[PDB]
Structures are given as structure tokens and as C-alpha cells.
Design a protein around this nucleic acid. Sequence first.
DNA 1: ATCGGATGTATATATCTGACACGTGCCTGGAGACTAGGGAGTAATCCCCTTGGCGGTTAAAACGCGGGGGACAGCGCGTACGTGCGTTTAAGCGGTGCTAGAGCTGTCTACGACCAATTGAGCTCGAGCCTGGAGACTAGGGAGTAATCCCCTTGGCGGTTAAAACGCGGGGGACAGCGCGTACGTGCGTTTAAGCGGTGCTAGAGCTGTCTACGACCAATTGAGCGGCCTCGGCACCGGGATTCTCGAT
DNA 2: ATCGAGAATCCCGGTGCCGAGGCCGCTCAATTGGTCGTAGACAGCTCTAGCACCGCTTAAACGCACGTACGCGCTGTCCCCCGCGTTTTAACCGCCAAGGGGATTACTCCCTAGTCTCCAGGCTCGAGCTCAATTGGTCGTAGACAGCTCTAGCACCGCTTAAACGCACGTACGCGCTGTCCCCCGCGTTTTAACCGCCAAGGGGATTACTCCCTAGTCTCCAGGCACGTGTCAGATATATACATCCGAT
Lengths: 74, 69, 77, 79, 78, 95, 96, 97, 103, 102, 102, 90, 92, 92
Amino acid sequence: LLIRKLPFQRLVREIAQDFKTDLRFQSSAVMALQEACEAYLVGLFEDTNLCAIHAKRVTIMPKDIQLARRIRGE
Amino acid sequence: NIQGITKPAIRRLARRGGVKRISGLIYEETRGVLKVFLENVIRDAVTYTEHAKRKTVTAMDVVYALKRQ
Amino acid sequence: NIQGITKPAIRRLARRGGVKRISGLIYEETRGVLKVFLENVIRDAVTYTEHAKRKTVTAMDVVYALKRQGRTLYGFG
Amino acid sequence: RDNIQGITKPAIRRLARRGGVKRISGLIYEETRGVLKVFLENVIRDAVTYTEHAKRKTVTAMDVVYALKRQGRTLYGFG
Amino acid sequence: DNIQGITKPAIRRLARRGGVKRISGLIYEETRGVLKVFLENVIRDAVTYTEHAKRKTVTAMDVVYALKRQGRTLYGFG
Amino acid sequence: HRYRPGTVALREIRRYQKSTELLIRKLPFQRLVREIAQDFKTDLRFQSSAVMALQEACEAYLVGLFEDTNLCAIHAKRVTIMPKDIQLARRIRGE
Amino acid sequence: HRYRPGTVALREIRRYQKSTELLIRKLPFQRLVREIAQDFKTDLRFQSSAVMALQEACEAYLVGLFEDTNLCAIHAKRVTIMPKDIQLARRIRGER
Amino acid sequence: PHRYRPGTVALREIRRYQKSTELLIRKLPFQRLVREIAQDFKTDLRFQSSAVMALQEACEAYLVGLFEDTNLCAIHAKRVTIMPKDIQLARRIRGER
Amino acid sequence: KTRSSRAGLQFPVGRVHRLLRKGNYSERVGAGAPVYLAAVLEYLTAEILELAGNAARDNKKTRIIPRHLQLAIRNDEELNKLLGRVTIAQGGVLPNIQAVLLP
Amino acid sequence: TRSSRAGLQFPVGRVHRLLRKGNYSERVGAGAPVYLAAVLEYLTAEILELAGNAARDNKKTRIIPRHLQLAIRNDEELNKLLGRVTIAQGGVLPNIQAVLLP
Amino acid sequence: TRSSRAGLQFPVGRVHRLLRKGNYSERVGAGAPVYLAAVLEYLTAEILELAGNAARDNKKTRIIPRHLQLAIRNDEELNKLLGRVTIAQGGVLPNIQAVLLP
Amino acid sequence: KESYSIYVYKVLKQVHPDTGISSKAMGIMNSFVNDIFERIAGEASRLAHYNKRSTITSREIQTAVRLLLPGELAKHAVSEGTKAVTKYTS
Amino acid sequence: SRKESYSIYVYKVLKQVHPDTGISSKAMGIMNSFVNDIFERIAGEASRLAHYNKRSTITSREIQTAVRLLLPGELAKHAVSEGTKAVTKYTS
Amino acid sequence: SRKESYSIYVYKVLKQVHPDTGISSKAMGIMNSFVNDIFERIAGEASRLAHYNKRSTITSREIQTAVRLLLPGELAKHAVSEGTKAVTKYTS
DNA sequence: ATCGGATGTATATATCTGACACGTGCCTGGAGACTAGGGAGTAATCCCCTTGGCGGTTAAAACGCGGGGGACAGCGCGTACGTGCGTTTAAGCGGTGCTAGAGCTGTCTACGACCAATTGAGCTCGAGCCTGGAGACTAGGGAGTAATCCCCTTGGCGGTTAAAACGCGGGGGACAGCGCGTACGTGCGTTTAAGCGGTGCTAGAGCTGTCTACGACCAATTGAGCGGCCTCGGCACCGGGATTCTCGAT
DNA sequence: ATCGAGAATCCCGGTGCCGAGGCCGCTCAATTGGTCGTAGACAGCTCTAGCACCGCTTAAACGCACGTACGCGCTGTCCCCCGCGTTTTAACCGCCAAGGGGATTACTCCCTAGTCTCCAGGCTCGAGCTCAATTGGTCGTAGACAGCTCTAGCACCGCTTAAACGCACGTACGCGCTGTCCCCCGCGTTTTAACCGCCAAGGGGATTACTCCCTAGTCTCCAGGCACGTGTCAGATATATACATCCGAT
């Protein structure tokens, strides 16, 4: 896994706190969220790279990410 | 808390994705995208948790959230 | 006398058993099976008659033979 | 709890082998377990009845032998 | 060779509806291939449903289910 | 007019499964019973109801055996009972 | 008189984006559908609305694909869609 | 590497277990099963050891015979694999169902 | 006053007692045993006659005949179990055609 | 009718029957078809509201599929709900990229 | 002893007592336990004979349940008499259906 | 020659006042009662013997009923036996 | 030959929201397809929810939760409000 | 604690038929089980015969008929032979 | 197919020991005479009656058989399943050791069941009439079996609009080249990741208990759907106004 | 880039008129009111699992500069290639025309649910007797009750074979076609099962007599049962021989 555990945990609790109070978390739930986020980001970066090469570039720029996400339907 | 997802972590994810060079503006965009994804998934997870009348998000809630999107 | 159990009779028994089509070879085979059954029951039935020093096999003798052979018969007591 | 699962797949395979079975469908195993449970239930019910009639708290070998004899599966040597 | 019935002006018109202003000569053959692939995948699924129903006429509903299971929901032929 | 093979057979099944009369002729059955009895003890006579009891028992046995035979036939994806079906039924019954 | 390259194209774009009529010829599409189905099962028949459904679905799919293709072309600072645009669109959609 | 063809080892195992007499179900798991089932009839019951061995002998004898009958039903259908439909047919003819 | 009346039964408690005494079952028979036995026999008779009567009513007959008894017994799982090895004379069989045999 | 008791226009009884016969679960609560019908009614009302607005904008008194396409795609949440949906005879939104103009 | 008078090994007196206390009849004739003891002795001798034969075939000097099972099941009439009987630790007869062999 | 005919008829009149019974059916009912009598009495005898008891009591009858009768038939029969013994004792 | 649809109920809702506006057969057909689609989505998610929680009954709670997963934001909030109001009047 | 069994008689028969052969405890238990089982079968059938014939006495005749009913074929003939010889020797 | 050769099991085989038969010793309880008493199986004998048999009569199942149409035992082919490894935990088993509790045997004492007449009713059997099943019989519906018709599916044969495809020239694609500002690797100072213990506490999961809310089932019903019909919204036609990109002019 | 002219296309107004939109008659089926058995659903009470949370430690990980060369973006030319209009061509569309398996229908026969007599079929009243209550004891079976001691249960520790889990993979299950058998369906000949009825007598069923044979009670001694001490036969271990399987070839 490529993201540090503790900042991810804190981010997850922060985001969750704005939907429902007093939540606790199972360890495996946070690890599940981390595998899912990292897999999603890796796939998005793959698509972004394809968009960058399409524009005769080798550097991914924000419009590449935004195009990938638009075609994905996000 | 969003600032805890550091620049080298995003670099490491991009490296696994085959990216060789990364514009400086990429990092913030990536963080925003990540936040959106997380919001959606966690929203579903917590929705499942509430139906079961639990206070602990379980691994199965998360798996179900991923399945349903 | 075994040939007196005619072909249409065996067909009728099979119909009551729910059989729709019948191979030609069933009939002799069925008679043999029937003969064996009868022999066994009658062998036992006559034995009961002999214990009572009688010469007439009664309905009760047959009912007792069938019951003790696990084939209990109702209504003829 | 869930003790029927202690009748393992290789054990059922062994029993089928002794019965002369060379190949066994995957669905046999669960099916066999159900059948076995019913059999055991039927025997044990009768066995426990005998124990209760005798005002005992220990199921004896004779209770089981008698139960088997009653249902029609006499077992020799345990009386 | 019915794929050739998807004519050059038809593909141009479709591209116009898509907002495309200029079209390389090689686009058209490529488009035909893509379209053909799509049809196979949809029709295959459609025929499976027909075969499951032991029917000999592919209905609109068979197609609606094929599209649904392909994530391309089409409204109005139910 | 001609009914197709199988329709009349099923019709006969419904007819005879609906009703209850004995299905073997009395007199040939009686001759068979007396013949078999003669090989065990000489000079035997029979009560009428004894022969009726024996016939009820034989026909009940055969109907049940034919039911099992039919189950064996359907098991082999056939609809025609064959001697091997009878032999399977009797072997599994313990005869 | 002569309009410059692109003006009439834009007029056609506005025209089609205003109307709703189907854009593939009915009969050649019908022949295509019957041919493809026949290479799966011989002697098939078709209800009329089944063929019309396939045609509506095909045109909707192609127009959407052409939308995404156009965005991919513009991303590369082009205005002309190219095979690599179609392949990128289908790769990102997850069809290829 | 050496590899036996499908069936050769099956036949060897058949010969092995019909040659011998040892019990084929594990003692302790069967014991737990017996106690569970009995407890679902009367709580706090005890068992003599020989009672559990008797129950196990009965179950294994019943199952071996049942598998013999399933095998005969399977061979009748020109198959070599016994299937649930074989068990239900065998038990129907036995009069258990 | 008869024992059946005191026990609320129709079956003859005294007669059942005599048949137990003379059936060579045990040297002695308790007073409650024939009451219980008569009660069990009466229960089973009432259930069997109930079902057979129902079958008779479906057939628009006012008298129960053996056919109705066969339908009643074989169509009830527990009665069929009790009489698994019993032949009811002139009973016939249950209507049953294997699905594979139908057109 | 249950629809009248609940103040709805969509058929609660019919929705109940469809839940029963769609093989979704063995049992169905009394409130479930009411809730589903109410949600269905709201979404129907919202799409028809937007389509009517579009129809009047086009000086048409009759809503046609084109108005449905405009209504759905010009509303972010309806467009999200029907992101993978084709409205037959709907067309597309008028839209020309700024870079394409002279 | 009555066993000696009858030339038997099985206990006539014991069989008579068990018949008296088994509630089989009010009275028991003098010949009945002799006959019964003789039949039991004969059947014991036949089973032990066959089991001994099997034991010697296996080059064993002690009869164990396996030999009893072989003896009973390999004799058609004994197998019939004990058709519904399980011999503990008896195993089964070696027997493979011809269609399964290669 | 004894039979249960009058008691079977009384039960029939209890459950179906306007229903009769054929001679053959009555014979079948007699066969039924004798069969179940023999089965239950024999099993009760074995229960008493098995336990070295010289008395057949209602408890042996009840246990035999539990062994012979299936499920609901067994439960209802036991209920009827207990009710009958309680009514008889007082 | 009786084929049921939601057409008349859709028309009553239409008359509620736009009294002098009608609807074409094609557009009404689109509405019917729409209603069946959303029906399937909500009922299916509710079935999965009940299975997930080892419940054999779909209640208004499963319907409500399914609506929250499937509908976006304010659309979901308004639909939930309508459903809850409808259920409380029905229960009374 | 006195428990009677047929063990010594089974062993004597074994020594008659196989002078140099022994028997395991399990096998001896099987022999005791066997003798008790066959005893029960024969005595019960003889009791039934006596009842059937309205006789209050079980005689060698009831035993003989039970043996003929219960034992198959040649086994029955030999058992009857052994019993008759034993009864005639006893009577003298 | 049978023949070499190799593996790879089993089968018998000398070698050795401990635990299950085996012969031993001693006790008591149970088979044995035996005597006598009480009682059921045997033996004519008698009536009649049920089942052989006769024997003639008759009509309904059985038989033989020819025809035809529907399973049958292959025969081949697809693919998917169970099996047989080889590997890594789960736990079965024996080792030991406890540790009660319920069979178990023996004691005592009120009670319950078997009788022995002794009575009084429930029941079985014979006439005495009767009354609703069985059979002869009839219209309703099922049944196959064609077999005339709806819905498509090809084929003819034209207007006709739209495709083809050419020529053109107008203009992005795109190539190269160059200038820039910006990530990258790297090295160093720092900070919190991880993570090791280490605590204290809610609630997920579980175990008992009860009840509402639901299938589901019957009995009355009215809302919707289908068809039929009326009606104008729009829909293309045509003519007029505008507008909208296009070219001369700076 | 911006001024004017301008023409070709679009927009729009206004209009004949037609086809789906809208609305009613009739039905009838799906809907719903009322009832009940039920249990799944909810609710209530325990606990110890796992997590909220922290006090310290280190140390890879991360934040922050150095510079720095590199891809990213602008910019001039080229080209080649693709839209625009013209003219040409031909398949598309209308429709028109008919035909062919599909088709549900109706068009014919044979049962089945339902009707109309005629009884045999139990149903009812009186005589009867064998059998079911009664009670006062007896004696013995059996239900409390006291100890004991074995044995069922429970826990802990190796450990070792077994079981649970990937990974090929070829064998078999299953399926479709099928040439052929052979099994069923009517017909119509012919017994032969079934009926009426009559007679006889062998044996069954009951009646009474009676005589041998079963039981029970007492004392015994002696065979059988509880242990008991002790080999040696079966279980355990390397040895080894042969007996199947299985891969390259007759």
C-alpha cells in the first residue's frame, strides 16, 4: 500500500464525521477503504496517462484527469 | 485532514500507474478527486451501517458499497 | 398353469402401476417373479394349516404369512 | 454446533469407496449429510425414549441396540 | 457484406449529430468495425434470452434486457 | 380415427388407477394357486376367501413392484420398463 | 459563391442537434441486422419494432461515442477526430 | 512425474477398505454430532462410550449399504457416478422415503 | 357404570383389559393401561374416520368404502408412515403419473 | 383505495402486486409499496414539470421526447440519475465548442 | 442334566427357564427347550464351521468378526437368515462391478 | 366372535352423524384396530421386559406410542391418553 | 388481451402539475419505461438490503434506504420526505 | 453381579467343530448376540403359533413349525433333523 | 493389442514383544429329581356346509395379427468435474490428570393389581322392514385434426432523392525548431508512522420470549383497459420578412 | 482586425386538414374487506472483543532548497487531404402483388359429469348370555431412599496423520441424430372366464370325555460365573519378492 495509514485513517474519520456523529471504525473497514481508493487512483492514473499520450505529451496535466473522469461518467 | 495525503504518496500511486513526469498542479486535482470518491463510497457504507442499526462500520459494509457502484 | 396369468392381465397390473409402455420380455419375467412370491407365501401358509392339523388353508393363514413376511393384509381377519 | 460438518468430504469419500463407488459428484456430500442426520435423529430419538422410560440420564449401548432392532436394523454384539 | 449499408454520408450525419466538423477518410471504415462489434455483443445477448424463452422471434423486450445487462438502458420500448 | 402411441396407455392408467376391481381373472389364478399348493402338501382344499386373499396380495405386490420398476425406468431416462428394471427393484427391496 | 470549409459543417451540426429523425437508412440497417442474426441462427424472423429498437440503440450509441471522440480530439488541440480518438474513447469507457 | 490414470487409485482404495474392518468416521467429531443431536432432544444427557461406538457402527453400516445400492442404481443408468437422484431413488425403493 | 363412561371413551376399556390379560403380554396389567390403550385406539379411529369421511364427501357418497380409506391413509404423511407395509384390500392406489410420461 | 388513503396518484395496490410477483423477497411490508409509489410519483412529477417548462419555452403546448431530453440533461441531478440512459427521439443538447468558432 | 440326556452342548435347563420367564406361554412342554437348544446348537455349529473355514483360508487360527461376515454373506441361506443384520467390524465382501474396471 | 364394530360405529356417529359404513370398510376398521392394538401392546411388553418390570403401566403404553406414532399423531395420541387417564382416575 | 400500464396514473400526475398539458403516446411510453426502470432499481436494492441484513421482509425502511443509495442529493431528500409523509398518513 | 451368557456353550461347540481354533472377545459377543436373537425369533413365532391354534402349551411342535417358518430350505431340514434326534433321545 | 523397462504399490517374511485368551480356583444358586396335584390336549362323533365338481349356457376378455409410428441403443462430440497430487494448518488422538454424579445395589413400606365369587348390564343373534348405492342411461365438454386465414417475407417496378465520386482549392495537421519555467533527483534537517505495550470501556453478537402483521384465502366490486368515436394541434405548403455569413474596400 | 451590399438560407405568419389525443360504455379481473394461524420480527438482557486512545521510541519518510537540464508551448512552412458543388448514378421507398409457413381458430368424434329406475344393503326392534363392575385382602411388584464407586466428563500438551486448499486435466456426463426395432392400436375370431344352479361329501367346527403331562415346592451339589495369574498369538518392524500400473514401442 502506498498511502500512509494514519493520515488516511484521520481523513476517513473527518469525512465520516460530517455525515453521522459518534462513529467508530473496524480496522478492516479502513483497510478496505484504502485498498479501494488506491486501486481507483491507479486506474484513473492509467486513463490519465492514455489521455496524456493522446495529446503527444508524457506529462499528465489536470485536463487529462478531468477528461478521463468525464468519459468515465464522474 | 486532506493535507495528510502527501505529495510523495500521490507520486508513488502515479509511478505504479506508469506516469513518468507529473505537473505540479496534478497533486491538488488528485486530492479533490480522491475526496469525491471517498465521500461517495463512505456515504454508501454509512447508509448500510444505519440499516443494520450498528455504530461500527464493518468491512462487509465497505465491500457492499464498492459492489453497488 | 403359470401361463394362465395372461398377457393382458399383466398389462393391466402394469397400467395400475402407472406404466405406459411394456417390453415384450416383461411378461414371462413377471410370471416368474409372481410364482416365487406365491410359492413363498403358500409355503408358509400351508405350514400354519399343518400345525393346526387342518386340511383347509384359511384366509387367516394367508394373512398371518403375509404379515410375518412384512406384507400385512387388512380386512380379511 | 454445526457438528454435521465434522462428517468430512474425505470421510464420505472413504464410505463410498467401501461401498464400491469410484467417482462421486460434488453434490453428493451435502446430500449424504442430510440423509445421515435424519438416520441418526430417528435412531437417537428412540434411544432417548428408552432412557427416559428407564428414568436414567445415561444412554446405554442397549438402548441404541434396541432402537436399531425396532426400526429394523439389528446390530449384533453390543449387548 | 451488409456492413457496407452503413454508408459514408450516414456516418457523416451521425458525426454531425456528435458535433464533428471534419472527418478523415479512414474514420468511416473504423466506425463500421466498431458498430459491428457493438451489434454482435448486443445481438448475442438478445439471442440468448430468446433461446432461453424457447421462442423463435426476437422481441423488443429481449433487446431491452440485453441493453440493460450491458448498462445501456433504453427507455420506451417496454 | 387413431390415437397416437401413448395417449390410450395414459387413459388406461387413469381409468384403472381410479377404480378398484381385481385385475387377474379368478379361474386361472385359482388353477395356479392349486398347482403351487399341490407341490407342498397333498389333498389340500381352499376356502374361497383364502384364494381372494391370495389374489389381492399378489396384485398389490405386483402393482407396488411395477411402481418401483417405473421409478427405475424414469431414472434411466426411459419410459419403457425392462427386465433389468424389475431385477433392480427386487434386488433393492431385498428379494 | 462558395462557403469556407467548416461553415456548412457547423450548419449541419446545428441542424442535426435540433432534429430527432433517425440517421441510418432503414432498409440497409435491416439487412445488416438480419445478416448478423443469421450468422448466429438460421431462418430467424424479426418483429419490426425489434429492428427499430436495434437501430435506435445503435444511433444513440454512435452519437455518444462521437461526443466523447470529439472531446478527445479537442484535448489534443485538434478539431479532427482520428482513429486514436475512437480507441481512447472506448478504452476509457471500458469497452476495450 | 508419475501419475495414475483416473480410477486406478479409486479401485485400489475400494480394495483397501473392503479388505479391512476399521471404522471410517473420526471418533470424536461423530461423538460431538451424537451429543448435539441428543441434546436437541433432552438437555444434560450423558452417553456410555460403547453407546457412541454402537451408534457409529450403525451409521457406517447403514451408509455403506446405502452406497452399495446407489452404486447399483448408477450402473443401471449406464453411469459410473452416483448422484443425489440415485440416493433418493435407492431410498424410495428401500421404503425410507 | 362402565369404565369407558368414566374415562370419556367409546372404545371398550374392559374388553381391551381382558385382551391384554389373555394375550400373554405380561403376568399383570395395571388399571390405567387399558384406559390409555383404548384412548389411543379411539384417537386413531377418529382421525382415520374423519379423513375417510372427508374423502367420501368429495365423492358424494354417504358411506365410506375402502377406496376412501386408501385415499385418506396414503394422502396423510403420518398415517402413510404408520401403515407403510400394510395392504388395504380393494383400496387401489393413489392417482400418480410420472411427469416424464406425460406428453 | 390505498392510494387515496395515502394521498397518491400512483397505484399502491398494483405496486404491491408487482413487489409480490417480482420475486424480490418472500414477504413485503404494508408500507413498502406506499413508499415506492410516492417516490415514483415525485420523480414523475419532477420530469413532467421540467418537460412542461421546456415545452412552453418552445411555444409548444405538447411535450414531446425532445422536451424530455432537454429537461433531463439541463438538470444536473436528473442527468446524473439517467447518465447511462438513452431517451428515444431525444436528440442531444445544442452545444458548440468555443475553440471551433471563427 | 437334560443337555446330557439329549446329547447336546447348549443348556436345555437354561433355555427352559428363559422360556418360562420370557412370557411366551402359560405352560411349556418338556420337549420344547430340547428342540430349541438343538436348533440353536446346529446354527452355531454351521456359522462357526464356515467362519473357521474362512479363518484358515486367511491363515488365521482365531475367528474374528471379518471371518463371521465372510461366512454369513458367502452362504445364500445364512445370508437370507441374517439379511437385515449388521455384523460389527465385519466389513464387506470384495466386489467391484465389472463396468468400472479398465 | 368379538369385534370393535359397535365402537367404530359410535365413533363414526360422533364425527359424522349422517355417515354410514360398508361391511368391507367396517372389516378394514377392525383390522386397523387389531393391528394397532397388537403393535402397541407388543412394544409395551418389550419395554416392560427390557427394564425387568412385571407391570405394564400407562407409561409403557405412552412410550410405545412415542416410538410407533409419527409427529402430530404421536403428540395428539399422548394428549388423549393423558386426558383419558386423568378423567378416569377421578 | 389485457396489458396493464401506469398510463392513467401518469396522466393524473401530469394534470396535477400541468393542468392544460397533454402527453403523446411515445412520451407516455417513455414515462412508463422510466417508472418500471426506477421500480426495478429501488425494489432490487431493497431486496439486496434485506438479504444483506438476514431479513426476510422488505419494509418501508429498506425502501427508504434504497432511495437514499439510488437517488442523488436533494432529489433523494425530497423523495424520502414524500415517502415518509405518505407512510404516516397511511398508517393512521 | 452375576451375568449369565452362552459363552461356554459356544466355545464347546467351537471345540467340537475346530479343536485347535479360538475365538476373540468381539466374536464371542457376536455369537451371544446371534444365539439370543435367533432364540427370540423362534420363541416368538412358536408363541404366535400356539395362540393362533387356541393352545395354551408351547410344545416341540410349535418349535418345529417356527423353525420351518424361519429357517431357509436345507438349513431348516438339518435343524429339524437335529431337533428330532435330540427330542427322541431325551424321551428315551 | 503384448513387450521392455521403470516405478510403485502390495504380499509374504523373518524378528520381537505385550495384552487378550486360557486354564485354575473357589463359591452359590439353579437346574435337577421327585412327589403330588390340577388341568389342558386327544378322541370319537355328529351336523352341516362350503367347496369341489358337473354340467350346461352364454357373452366378454384373449388371441393373432397386420400397420405404423414413436422410443432405443448406440455414436460421436463438447466441455466441465472429480481426482490426484503437493503444501500448509486443524485438530484427533493418546497422555495424563483429575473430579464429581448418576448408575447401581440394596432396604423398607404403603399400595395396587389379581383374584373368587356375585351381580347386572352391553352385546350378538333373529326377524322385520325399510331406503338411499349400482346400474342403465344422457347431454356437456374434451379431444384431435385439419385447415382456411394474419402476418409477415420475397419479388416487381417505377420516382427520386440522395449517394458517389471528381475536381478544386482552402486551409488545418503536422513537422521542426526554439525559447522557457518547472518538476526531478538528491541531499539534508525534521516529524510523525509505526508500533510496542497497555487500559478502559460500548456494543456486535448472541440467547430467551412474546406478539403484530402477514400470507392467504374467500367473498363482493369498481377502476382501468379496450374499443369506438369526436375533435382540433400541429404539420407540411406557401408566401413574405428577416439574418447571416460573404465579398469589395483600409 | 472593421465599414458597407448582398444573397441564400432560415425564420415566421397564416392556413387547409388529418391522425393521434382525449374521453365514454362495458366489462371483469385484479383488487380489496374481513379472519385466522403463524412466526419472523422485534424486543429484552449478557460480555468480553475489539476498538477509542495514549505514553514513549526511531527512523523511514517527508518537507525544503540547488540547479538544472528537459519536455511544453508558441511559430513559420509545407502539404495533402478533405469539405463544397456538379453532375450521375442507383438503390431506397412506396406500394403493390403475391406466396408460405405459421395459427388460432373452428370442425368433427368419444369420452365424462350428470339423470332416472331398482332394488340388495345395511338399519331397527326384541331375546339373550357371556362378559364387565365390586370388594376385601394378599402378596408381591415397585416407588422412595442411602451410600459408593466407577465412569462420564472436562481440561492441557505434544504430534502426527489427516484434512483443507490451489492446479492441471482427461476422463467421463450430457446431448443430438439417428437407423431400426418393436411396441401399441384396432379388428375380428374364439375360446374361455364368468354365470345359474344343482348335487355331495370330507372335513371343519363344535360337544363331551379323560388321561397323560404340565406345573409348583424343597433340598442338593455341582456346573457355571467371578475373578486370577499367565503364556503365546496377534500386533509391530525392517526385509524382501513379486504383482500391478504405466510410459516408449511389437
